[PDB]
Write a protein that binds this ligand. Structure first.
Ligand SMILES: [Mg+2]
Ligand SMILES: [Mg+2]
Ligand SMILES: [Mg+2]
Lengths: 217, 212
């Protein structure tokens, strides 16, 4: 019965800063000789990757920016300097008795605030002739993560048939992206003239809006 | 090198049983214990149990004692996990991992098997091109089941400026979109095309992004 408490659950750090992640245990994991604590890194859609074994040994092929320390009851993972690619979830782990993983720490990168690049697409002709109409809006490469999308038809807000999807933090530039899709019937679509998606973001006082007129082509 | 190859994605109906595989290569199979882990979308890692292939000994996390059965075949160098009495709560990614002699570290992991436990029927995607300095083009993949789909552009050539968003489930069907950004000189002078694969329905579709 060894409980692992990992902290913090979330950590946001600037490029070049030091990140420090902690894992403690109710009993010592070092009484027989070595310290049975390991550290893993996991990025979305991938299996976890071993970074550090036995508290302080750097796994083969992993960079020296990562290091582990501690003994008995308290353990830390240090990343220094932090790089854009380090955006990930980190886990501690102990075996001995009952194998246990820590709850994990999500590392997020800090960077400059960035307005979304907004682009809007009318339904494709292929979709209309199957009886459907999806209006797609991309809101790309923005920071920070929080963002509001609103849909308007002929100058008034619609909310039905809207589906939103967000990406994880970008590995290279630390930005976020989002898509918003407004789905109606072909017949419904052709009853209105103007379609608008607008983003409310932390960068601008005014929202970023992109619109089109159905009857352009 | 050491390698762990897990079976592909599986869709089963509730109440069913499923058997996933973890095929080991590059080492003496019976010499290493193999572990299994469950991970639900955006959540932590839950230990399921282990199989010692040398004597077929097993142990489980209490949570999976009734749910999971681990086995191994020495000849085929393969570890298996059978999950029984399935429900939607068992929908997750499942990982196998080899425990090393070196400090009991898990240095090698399988790529993961995604299980969907659902009653919904298999359905192919409808792929729609989204046509409109840089230019952003789109590809809408609508109304498929189950996950996953695989989207590429020019068969991976345009990988740089691509955002393929996570699928959203609505009315027992998934929909996702993918954006690609390229220089306005490259398009439409050169052809851009999204390639969508849905293995569950044996679907390979290419749609060229043509101006309206
Ligand atoms: Mg990596
Ligand atoms: Mg920049
Ligand atoms: Mg109607």
């Amino acid at each position: 019965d060894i409980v692992l408490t990992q902290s913090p659950a979330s950590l946001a750090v600037s490029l070049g800063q030091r990140a420090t992640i902690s894992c403690r245990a109710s009993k010592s994991v070092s009484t027989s000789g070595y310290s049975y604590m390991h550290w893993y890194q996991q990025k979305p859609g991938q299996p976890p990757k071993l970074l550090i074994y036995l508290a302080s040994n750097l796994e083969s092929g992993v960079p020296a920016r990562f290091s582990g320390s501690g003994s008995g009851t308290d353990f830390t993972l240090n990343i220094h300097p932090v790089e854009e690619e380090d955006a990930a979830t980190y886990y501690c782990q102990h075996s001995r008795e009952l194998l246990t993983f820590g709850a994990g720490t999500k590392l997020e990168l800090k960077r400059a605030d960035a307005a979304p690049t907004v682009s809007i697409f009318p339904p494709s002709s292929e979709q209309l002739t199957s009886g459907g109409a999806s209006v797609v809006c991309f809101l790309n490469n923005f920071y920070p993560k929080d963002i509001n999308v609103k849909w308007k038809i002929d100058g008034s807000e619609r909310q039905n048939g809207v589906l939103n999807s967000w990406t994880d933090q970008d590995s290279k530039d630390s930005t976020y992206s989002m898509s918003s899709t407004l789905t109606l019937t072909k017949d419904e679509y052709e009853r209105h003239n103007s379609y608008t998606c607008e983003a409310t973001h932390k960068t601008s006082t005014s929202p970023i809006v992109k619109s089109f007129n159905r009857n352009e082509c | 090198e050491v390698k762990l190859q897990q079976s592909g994605p599986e869709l089963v109906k509730p109440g069913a049983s499923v058997k996933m595989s973890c095929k080991a290569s590059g080492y003496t199979f019976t010499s290493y214990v193999m572990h299994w882990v469950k991970q639900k979308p955006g959540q932590g890692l839950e230990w399921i149990g282990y199989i010692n292939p040398y004597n077929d000994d097993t142990n489980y996390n209490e949570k999976f004692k009734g749910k999971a059965t681990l086995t191994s075949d020495k000849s085929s160098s393969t570890a298996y996990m059978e999950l029984s009495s399935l429900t939607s709560e068992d929908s997750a990614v499942y990982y196998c991992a080899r425990e090393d002699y070196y400090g009991s570290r898990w240095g090698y992991w399988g790529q993961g098997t995604t299980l969907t436990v659902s009653s919904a029927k298999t359905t192919p995607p409808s792929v729609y091109p989204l046509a409109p300095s840089m230019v952003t083009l789109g590809c809408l993949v609508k109304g498929y089941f189950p996950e996953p789909v695989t989207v590429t552009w020019n068969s991976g050539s345009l990988s740089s400026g691509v955002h393929t968003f996570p699928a959203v489930l609505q009315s027992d069907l998934y929909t996702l979109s993918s954006s690609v950004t390229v220089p306005s000189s490259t398009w439409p002078s050169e052809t851009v095309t999204c390639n969508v694969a849905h293995p569950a329905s044996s679907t390979k579709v290419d749609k060229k992004i043509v101006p309206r």
